[PDB]
Amino acid sequence: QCQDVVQDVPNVDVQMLELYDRMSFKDIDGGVWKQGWNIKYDPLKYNAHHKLKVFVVPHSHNDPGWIQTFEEYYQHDTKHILSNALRHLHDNPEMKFIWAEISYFARFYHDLGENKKLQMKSIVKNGQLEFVTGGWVMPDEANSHWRNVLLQLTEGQTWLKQFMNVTPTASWAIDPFGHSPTMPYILQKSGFKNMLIQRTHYSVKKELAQQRQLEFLWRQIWDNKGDTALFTHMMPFYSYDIPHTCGPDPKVCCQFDFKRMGSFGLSCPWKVPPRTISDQNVAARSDLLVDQWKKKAELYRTNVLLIPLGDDFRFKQNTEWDVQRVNYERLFEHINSQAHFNVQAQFGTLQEYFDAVHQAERAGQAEFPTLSGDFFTYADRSDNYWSGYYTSRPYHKRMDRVLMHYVRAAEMLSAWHSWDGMARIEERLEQARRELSLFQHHDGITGTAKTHVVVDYEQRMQEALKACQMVMQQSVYRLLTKPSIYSPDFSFSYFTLDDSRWPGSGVEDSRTTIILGEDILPSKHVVMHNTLPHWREQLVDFYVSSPFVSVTDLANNPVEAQVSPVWSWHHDTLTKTIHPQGSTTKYRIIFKARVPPMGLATYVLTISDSKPEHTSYASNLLLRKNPTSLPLGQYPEDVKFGDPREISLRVGNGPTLAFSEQGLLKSIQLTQDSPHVPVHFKFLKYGVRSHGDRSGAYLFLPNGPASPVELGQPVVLVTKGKLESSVSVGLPSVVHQTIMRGGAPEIRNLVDIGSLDNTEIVMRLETHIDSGDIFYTDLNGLQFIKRRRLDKLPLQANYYPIPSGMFIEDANTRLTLLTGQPLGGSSLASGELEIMQDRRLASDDERGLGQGVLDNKPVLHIYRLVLEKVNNCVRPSKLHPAGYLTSAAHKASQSLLDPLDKFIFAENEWIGAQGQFGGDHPSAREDLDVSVMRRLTKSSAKTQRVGYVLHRTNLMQCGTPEEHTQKLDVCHLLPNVARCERTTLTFLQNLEHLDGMVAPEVCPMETAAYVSSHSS
């Protein structure tokens, strides 16, 4: 019933991995079309009964932050563009305009009076102003998580449906730096019919153009049937600006950008300015322009041609609207009335273009090719590959993933109840969704904005995290307090969030110590939340004021715990070492929390005067020449010292890890019977070219392969505990930590590139896996795609986005690295994986930013490292373009991206406390997630509505027998269900009324949305 996503290789006309394997990437001068060739056309192709239909589509690219902040641009540019659009379109009925960025449109619309709102609605209604995509932003496609792509699309489309009563079905993505099939995946499931893309490698544009394969049905890589296909138009030329949109010769096209005549400070760099169209030159100018259009049309299969007309922050001035509109109207009048051109040209919208193309297709003009794959890594010219922004500003890349989780958790926790308006829950959740959605912009998460703009995004995300914390903690208080005892005040802090990994140890001393004492306060409630729809156990840790602490559950059952010191690291400028210091005033308590599906569990920490029965203490070993003592206050075990040596550790039944004398992993033995498999961590640095093109925020232009970071004799700290052990080493620019809790290790890097200008720090893994030239990287946390290292491409082209994970494998062994933040990475030799940590660039890379990247700050990167035997796994065949995680790797990814949330009760006594919430929630199969749970109605609605997005991944079968699991029917998670509907993923259209009000679970690799309606 479900499609098999593993075992059937789809047959498509263009499969991008295969196309890459065959294609030439030579950068040859193609003439006026520098990256193409001199286009020829048969003049007789067009005649009285077969005319070329041209749609000139005015647009204005508005970045929600880049060289100015969102609000700076809105005040300086965008408010003027939209005010002038409203005026000019209202006054000129044949003029059209498309608008993409709903963040700005909403910012504008809410400063409009009623009269202007009605005027605006009128030009939308009549089709003059058309929204394209309708997302809050035009998102990055490399670093963004699919959940956030959906978040921002939903934010924008919900706004448009509520205020404009429109839902776009055509998407416009002219600026993201390379393109992902995650986009058509999400769009096709959200009602879209067509999409347009632009920034693809110039060699791919040439290859596809030659074959008229620039318009294609883009299906997912595993889709044998084609049910996921979305019609896609790829623009053929170097840019979306007017010189690169009218046709192949920018010297000619520039003459048709009427903003470039002088009075607007713009000109044509090809040295021929535009001239005003008049009766004395209209025929000559028309001839020039039609010949460009006819050349562009040769690259496409129908007689319908798309001519975008715009550029960045265009259509700002009244006089600009006039100069473009009047000159084009003069051209259209001449061209259309002169039969010898056989052209009918008009202003159009994007949807108008696609409608006409499909009309032509239905008329049998053309059949379109099918395509799968992705469009990374982009290069716009020569060897200038845009793999730098897979890593740029990694602090904020990590912050994105943190906020992604806290928005999900806040929406889910608060969804269980309806809230009085005074609680301000909807206000806070809307703020958080909008700040996270804004950051998905292709100059946000990409790390390609100016320094002060990055600070604006950071501040906005900090406010969003605060809003999430507020909603979460109010929700926990409500869900775990006896209903007749619950006495909320909506401005009060019942709990504080405790997060061990953001900002992280050594980044910020943000964490609250639980203060207990025999003479003051014996015990403290803590609460864990599990956003995933299965029972979950995870070790959690808290800081406490004494090492003599016992843990119990809320039936007072003892829970095994481990206490460890609180270690921090310091670049000790006196002794010239990077070395740890232990706290003498607080300690870490660690225990396994077990939490219901989408639920909560309460535990209690209690002080004692001596070592508790069920709490053990870690040993600590400091390996270094020239040791000095490390006192630890009340901690009962003295630190031990040793000269650097190889060491091995094993927690529980789990793998045994060996470490070099520099405290870096060297090997992993999976079981007592198995071999010690070589897996070596190494840190290296890339530099920058002294002559020739410089790396910057966008571009990665290394001066050769990376060189090893010289480690000296680093200080190594070993902590050995029953529940958790770790090895940490202070290296130059990186405190590197491997943590073992009895399965796949966790890796944490506290990365501080300091003042190392023109350096990029990379973490590499070296193994004996014979992967050859193959490796796998994920796309938007949604799917893994097969990559092939090509030596016909330079090193920076073989870097790909690693938004959530990467792996290499051979017949028997796989090594998967899961990430808690998007970064760039590759496999540059058989058996290697590498992932960039940070980059500090003192030069601009000539893409408009006008600065390097010199605002680095310490960031705590997190990973899981999974080594597995895979000879028993049922994998795709050699020619299949996808890869799939194992269950262990998928759970490891979930542990990074959606960990348990931890709450500390903020006062001395919690009256009416309960031990659990969600004990009765079904525990769904491990491949299924409830990606979104969101209440859609305010508390006054008679009919309450809750939306759910359900995602089922596909995990490899490797012989672990499948346990029975419960069916999850989201429509029955809340009481009094009156209806259950399947909807588009934005919740905006009902697709199916569901029998028995039961929401079916979805197939592997499918995502479905459901809305349950409840009588209230």
Ligand X SMILES: O=C(Nc1ccc(Cl)cc1)O/N=C1\N[C@H](CO)[C@@H](O)[C@H](O)[C@H]1O
For the annotated catalytic residues, the residue numbers are: 175
- Check residue 996 for interaction with ligand X (CB under 6 A): no
The total number of residues shown for the chain amounts to: 1016
How many angstroms separate the CA atoms of 398 and 663, rounded? 25
Query: In this structure, are strands 577-595 and 599-607 parallel, antiparallel, or unpaired?
Result: unpaired
Nearer of residues 177 and 948 to ligand X, judged by Cβ = 177
Considering only the stretches 58-66, 451-459, 701-709, 780-788, report the one whose residues sit in contact with ligand X under the rule CB under 6 A: 58-66
Residue 891's binding partner among Zn ion, ligand X, none (Cβ under 5 to 8 angstroms by kind) is: none
For residue 436, give Cα distances in angstroms to 411, 464, 896, 948: 13, 7, 18, 19
Residue 848's binding partner among ligand X, Zn ion, none (Cβ under 5 to 8 angstroms by kind) is: ligand X
Exactly one of 61, 294, 529, 982 binds ligand X (CB under 6 A); which one?
61
- Check residue 848 for interaction with ligand X (CB under 6 A): yes
Nearer of residues 260 and 861 to ligand X, judged by Cβ = 260
Q: How far is the CB of 347 from Zn ion (least distance, A)?
A: 23
Q: What is the DSSP letter of 533?
A: S
How many angstroms separate the CA atoms of 851 and 385, rounded? 18
Phi, psi values for residue 325, rounded to 5°: -60, -50
Residue 847's binding partner among Zn ion, ligand X, none (Cβ under 5 to 8 angstroms by kind) is: ligand X
Considering only the stretches 60-68, 482-490, 777-785, 883-891, report the one whose residues sit in contact with ligand X under the rule CB under 6 A: 60-68
Q: How far is the CB of 453 from Zn ion (least distance, A)?
A: 12
Three-class secondary structure of residue 190 per DSSP: coil
Q: How far is the CB of 72 from ligand X (least distance, A)?
A: 14
Considering only the stretches 171-179, 220-228, 801-809, 835-843, report the one whose residues sit in contact with Zn ion under the rule CB under 5 A: 171-179
- In b/e form, how buried is each residue of 432-458, taking b as 16+ CB within 10 angstroms? bbbbbbbbbbbbbbbbbbbeebbebbb
- Check residue 241 for interaction with Zn ion (CB under 5 A): no
Residue nearest to ligand X (CB): 848
By CB under 6 A, the count of residues binding ligand X is 11
Residue 446: closest CA among 454, 434, 455, 437: 454
**Residues whose CB is less than 8 angstroms from the CB of residue 125 and which lie 6 or more positions away in sequence, other chains included:** none
Nearer of residues 63 and 374 to Zn ion, judged by Cβ = 63
Considering only the stretches 173-181, 256-264, 812-820, 966-974, report the one whose residues sit in contact with Zn ion under the rule CB under 5 A: 173-181
Nearer of residues 265 and 364 to ligand X, judged by Cβ = 265
Host H or E run for residue 210: helix 202-210
Considering only the stretches 168-176, 388-396, 561-569, 907-915, report the one whose residues sit in contact with Zn ion under the rule CB under 5 A: 168-176
**Residues whose CB is less than 8 angstroms from the CB of residue 150 and which lie 6 or more positions away in sequence, other chains included:** 186, 190, 931, 932, 949, 985, 986
Q: How far is the CB of 174 from ligand X (least distance, A)?
A: 9
- Check residue 448 for interaction with ligand X (CB under 6 A): yes
Q: How far is the CB of 309 from ligand X (least distance, A)?
A: 16
Considering only the stretches 18-26, 440-448, 598-606, 684-692, report the one whose residues sit in contact with ligand X under the rule CB under 6 A: 440-448
Q: How far is the CB of 447 from Zn ion (least distance, A)?
A: 14
Q: Tokens 């959605």 map to which residue?
A: 437
Written as one letter, the residue type at 189 is K
DSSP-assigned beta bridge partners for residue 570: 579
Q: How far is the CB of 360 from ligand X (least distance, A)?
A: 32
Considering only the stretches 61-69, 325-333, 642-650, 856-864, report the one whose residues sit in contact with ligand X under the rule CB under 6 A: 61-69
- Check residue 850 for interaction with ligand X (CB under 6 A): no
- Check residue 63 for interaction with ligand X (CB under 6 A): yes
With the CA atoms of 434, 435, 437 and 439 taken in that order, what torsion angle do they form, in degrees rounded to the nearest 10?
160
- Check residue 312 for interaction with ligand X (CB under 6 A): yes
Burial level of 676, CB count in 10 A (0-12/13-18/19+)?
middle
Contact 606, 615 (CB under 8 A): no
For residue 528, give Cα distances in angstroms to 377, 408, 462: 40, 15, 22
The H helix count followed by the E strand count for the chain is 16, 49
Nearer of residues 172 and 419 to Zn ion, judged by Cβ = 172
Residue 888: closest CA among 868, 862, 874, 870: 868
- Check residue 18 for interaction with ligand X (CB under 6 A): no
Tokens of 812: 């028997």
How many angstroms separate the CA atoms of 718 and 738, rounded? 10
Q: How far is the CB of 443 from ligand X (least distance, A)?
A: 5
Nearer of residues 444 and 730 to ligand X, judged by Cβ = 444
How many angstroms separate the CA atoms of 208 and 373, rounded? 14
Nearer of residues 258 and 313 to Zn ion, judged by Cβ = 313
How many angstroms separate the CA atoms of 870 and 875, rounded? 9
Q: How far is the CB of 682 from ligand X (least distance, A)?
A: 33
Q: How far is the CB of 847 from ligand X (least distance, A)?
A: 3
- Check residue 101 for interaction with ligand X (CB under 6 A): no
Contact 767, 912 (CB under 8 A): no
How many angstroms separate the CA atoms of 12 and 228, rounded? 13
Considering only the stretches 442-450, 474-482, 526-534, 869-877, report the one whose residues sit in contact with ligand X under the rule CB under 6 A: 442-450
Exactly one of 101, 141, 175, 969 binds ligand X (CB under 6 A); which one?
175
Q: What is the DSSP letter of 139?
A: B
Tokens of 949: 């997005």
Nearer of residues 100 and 304 to ligand X, judged by Cβ = 100
- Check residue 175 for interaction with Zn ion (CB under 5 A): yes
Exactly one of 155, 320, 443, 778 binds ligand X (CB under 6 A); which one?
443
Nearer of residues 64 and 612 to Zn ion, judged by Cβ = 64
DSSP-assigned beta bridge partners for residue 537: 594
By CB under 5 A, the count of residues binding Zn ion is 2
**Residues whose CB is less than 8 angstroms from the CB of residue 726 and which lie 6 or more positions away in sequence, other chains included:** 717, 718, 719, 737, 738, 739, 740
- Check residue 847 for interaction with ligand X (CB under 6 A): yes
How many angstroms separate the CA atoms of 249 and 232, rounded? 24
Nearer of residues 175 and 838 to ligand X, judged by Cβ = 175
Exactly one of 20, 46, 55, 66 binds ligand X (CB under 6 A); which one?
66
Three-class secondary structure of residue 687 per DSSP: coil
- Check residue 844 for interaction with ligand X (CB under 6 A): no
Mark 784-803 with x for binding to Zn ion (rule: CB under 5 A) and - for no binding.
--------------------
Q: How far is the CB of 763 from ligand X (least distance, A)?
A: 27
- Check residue 981 for interaction with Zn ion (CB under 5 A): no
The 3 state secondary structure assigned to 882-921 is EECCCHHHHHHHHHHHCCCEEEEECCCCCCCECCEECCCC
Exactly one of 10, 63, 354, 533 binds Zn ion (CB under 5 A); which one?
63
Angle at 222 between CA 184 and CA 181, to 5 degrees: 25
Please give the annotated binding residues, written as ranges: 61, 63, 175, 442
Phi, psi values for residue 368, rounded to 5°: -95, 145
Nearer of residues 141 and 926 to ligand X, judged by Cβ = 141
Residue 171's binding partner among Zn ion, ligand X, none (Cβ under 5 to 8 angstroms by kind) is: none
The dihedral through the CA atoms of 664, 670, 675, 678 has a sign that is negative
Please give the annotated binding residues for Zn(2+), written as ranges: 61, 63, 175, 442
How many angstroms separate the CA atoms of 13 and 609, rounded? 73
Q: What is the DSSP string of 614-633?
A: TEEE-EEEEE-SS------T
Chain contacts with ligand X (rule: CB under 6 A) = 61, 63, 66, 175, 312-313, 442-443, 448, 847-848
Chain contacts with Zn ion (rule: CB under 5 A) = 63, 175
